[PDB]
Design a protein around this ligand. Sequence first.
Ligand SMILES: Nc1nc2c(ncn2[C@@H]2O[C@H](COP(=O)(O)OP(=O)(O)OP(=O)(O)O)[C@@H](O)[C@H]2O)c(=O)[nH]1
Ligand SMILES: Nc1nc2c(ncn2[C@@H]2O[C@H](COP(=O)(O)OP(=O)(O)O)[C@@H](O)[C@H]2O)c(=O)[nH]1
Ligand SMILES: [Mg+2]
Lengths: 431, 48, 432
Amino acid sequence: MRECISIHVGQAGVQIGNACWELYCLEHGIQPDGQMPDDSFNTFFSETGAGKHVPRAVFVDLEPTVIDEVRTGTYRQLFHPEQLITGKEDAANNYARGHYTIGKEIIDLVLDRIRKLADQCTGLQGFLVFHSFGGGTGSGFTSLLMERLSVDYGKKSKLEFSIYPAPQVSTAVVEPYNSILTTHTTLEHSDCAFMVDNEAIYDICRRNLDIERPTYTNLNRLISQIVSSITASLRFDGALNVDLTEFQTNLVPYPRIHFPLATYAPVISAEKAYHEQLSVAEITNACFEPANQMVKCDPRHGKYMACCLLYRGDVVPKDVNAAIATIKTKRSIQFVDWCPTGFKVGINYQPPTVVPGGDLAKVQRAVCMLSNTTAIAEAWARLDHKFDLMYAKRAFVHWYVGEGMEEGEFSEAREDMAALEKDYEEVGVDS
Amino acid sequence: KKLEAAEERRKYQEAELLKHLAEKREHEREVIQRAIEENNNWIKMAKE
Amino acid sequence: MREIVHIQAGQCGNQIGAKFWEVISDEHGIDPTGSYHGDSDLQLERINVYYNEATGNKYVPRAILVDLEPGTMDSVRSGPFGQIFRPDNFVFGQSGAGNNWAKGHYTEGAELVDSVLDVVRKESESCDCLQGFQLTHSLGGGTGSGMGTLLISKIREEYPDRIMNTFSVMPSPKVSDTVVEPYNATLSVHQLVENTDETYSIDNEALYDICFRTLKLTTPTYGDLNHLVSATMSGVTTCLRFPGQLNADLRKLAVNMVPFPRLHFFMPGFAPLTSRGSQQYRALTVPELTQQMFDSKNMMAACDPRHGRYLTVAAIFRGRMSMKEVDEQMLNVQNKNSSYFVEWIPNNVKTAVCDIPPRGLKMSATFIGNSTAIQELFKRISEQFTAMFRRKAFLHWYTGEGMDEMEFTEAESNMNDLVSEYQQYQDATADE
Ligand SMILES: Nc1nc2c(ncn2[C@@H]2O[C@H](COP(=O)(O)OP(=O)(O)OP(=O)(O)O)[C@@H](O)[C@H]2O)c(=O)[nH]1
Ligand SMILES: Nc1nc2c(ncn2[C@@H]2O[C@H](COP(=O)(O)OP(=O)(O)O)[C@@H](O)[C@H]2O)c(=O)[nH]1
Ligand SMILES: [Mg+2]
């Protein structure tokens, strides 16, 4: 019934996956061995003959290090060994190695495992793909996998949770190249993609959680909370829900314009105790503050095409409508002329669950806003400019060419990004 | 004559509705077959 | 002319349909087990129009429950009167329509349609004299809208001589669950113009406005809107389910209400307006009930009747009242408001009085109007449609299902022709 397969690619994808699956287990009361003392959680967890609950997920990395930690860690019994796939040699921060050289060796094995998971589904909705833009596996292997999934799965829904690179936490000078190459190749294969800018997350951890030097553990716990908000509607049966198809219908007006901006509230430090409890009005107001965004950009300089508000916990429809009405009186929120119905609201009964010993405080109510704004084009522009700086000198290009890539592929990828930026511009113009 | 007249005049317009309604069945099968042929060819593309 | 076969399609269709069955079961003195426990022979006189009599004292709704999604069906079974329905009459898919008319009409809907027709055929072949069909659905969704209109066309093919009646709920931005509602509605209106004999235009814009403005409900729920729908559905079906002289069957109603084939979209009205909780109320006399016929505030379609002209009107008064007073009051309204009735259709207002009032009220009035003002509802849909279609926004959801742009252009053009047709008769004179 309505199953969703989660695929975690490369270090970023695998590590975010660890955070997501840890949180899902806490939310559904599943122990680290798969035992548990609703029924919608079955969309994400299959059940064995021994009453054990197994994530409907595949973890893939071209190097074994990251996944080796999962298979030695607290949740080693949660996953069956066959769903944790590792190669020997990584993609060395090279899209060409991930997509071609190294990727081509493990691709058939990964698809065979996904096929086995799909065979356990009676109503497979589609896939959720988690990866970084910057790493060779996250970029190269993901686009290879996305292409192969379109072949094997016809027109089955594919949603992404993409880690947009940040210099504060960047590991490669070539991340802009890998980001543009993966975006070009994956664009025609993805139905909806939620970008997570590592700088936005880094700044929220510093500002809201008082973490001087945020680590991936800090970043992922916060990311996991937003992913859980987006997936709660699939894993629980509330008063107001949204399936794989309804997300796309409400937020995606054109095939290529499939990048919603996520904004989460409240993000409160596990200290204080006075900084709560926030009302529905207060958390809703926080969604329109650029400081709570998952991607750095300015919506006041862009136009909205769709706004989805996903509430969780002690929330009443009357409270929500009152909050939306006051926000509507703040003239500053502009929508495109071809869009009337702006607000789609969902309420899920369960208050946000936090990881014990985590940085986040327990709150009675939280909200995740998914908005399709033309302001997200600013994130593409920043990436495209960094690409152009290096590409004008062909700096580092030899690494890709050496792996069998052609320079024409770089021009093609960049032209496609120029067309994407042009699409966001065309969409914001009035008729 | 002026009664089987009605009987026959009745039928042309029923047969007619059934045509106007076989035509509505046509389209459906065409737009559902076209809803596969295209997906069939996107992968015909994708593989090669 | 005896039996009516009822069909409920989609979330809205099933929600409104379930409320219709609990309201009419209560009026006919039928409990959730199917047993008659009333104390009036009028309750059973025409019970066969909506209920089949099963072995013994039990009555079963001649209702078919349809959805492409299973959840709504479970909610119906769990409900107050959920147990009254025929188990074999629940026909549901597993793969929903995702608020996409194309999925409901061409893909998923087409796959389930035969399973539904098999159940409708079973009910129809059991009938001594089938009047026709009654469908409850929304026009803004995918199942109710797309599959509902597909069912109408498939049923019309097998039963071309039976009356096709619908209770079609119009979408509104005020109570919207999807951005594509103008597309789904326009595509459905195109189907209804061609395939139904009579359609009750139940507007969510009007229901929301009544709840918010009149009932002073700050945040209206579907439960609040559905209380007005069920009161209207009970009122408009009074003539079909109780002994009476006027509009006693679906065909006589159509013959009295439809002067031109395409102009079969009715504007329903109801007085007094009440909220679910309001079990007060102390009010409503015959002159008071009659005055609300021209009252835009009492219309279930968001149109001002004074912005058009009535081609035909059916007015149903319920409760213990003077038939003499009703006749005087009704004549007064036609004489005073001469300008809002077409002069070329003589004695175009027909009145009926039923002794049995609906639940909670001692006195009520239901209006069924065939008004040229209904063009305001169609104009609203066309302008919302064009705002989106001009930019081909969300079109990929439909073309992705195998649909062509031409179908969109055709549906829009047909709906605009309907508006133009209403305007033509609004301006027509008895220059004869
Ligand atoms: N939020 C977050 N970002 C991460 C994490 N790990 C890596 N990243 C980011 O992802 C990019 C680096 O790519 P990786 O995922 O580490 O590399 P990879 O996919 O394993 O690819 P190769 O090692 O080259 O084969 C940089 O932008 C990092 O900041 C993580 O756990 N969380
Ligand atoms: N009056 C009323 N309208 C409803 C109800 N449920 C949904 N709607 C409306 O119906 C449209 C959405 O269609 P819906 O019936 O939910 O979709 P479907 O299941 O695919 O037929 C919108 O115009 C909603 O506002 C309900 O219970 N009552
Ligand atoms: Mg790595």
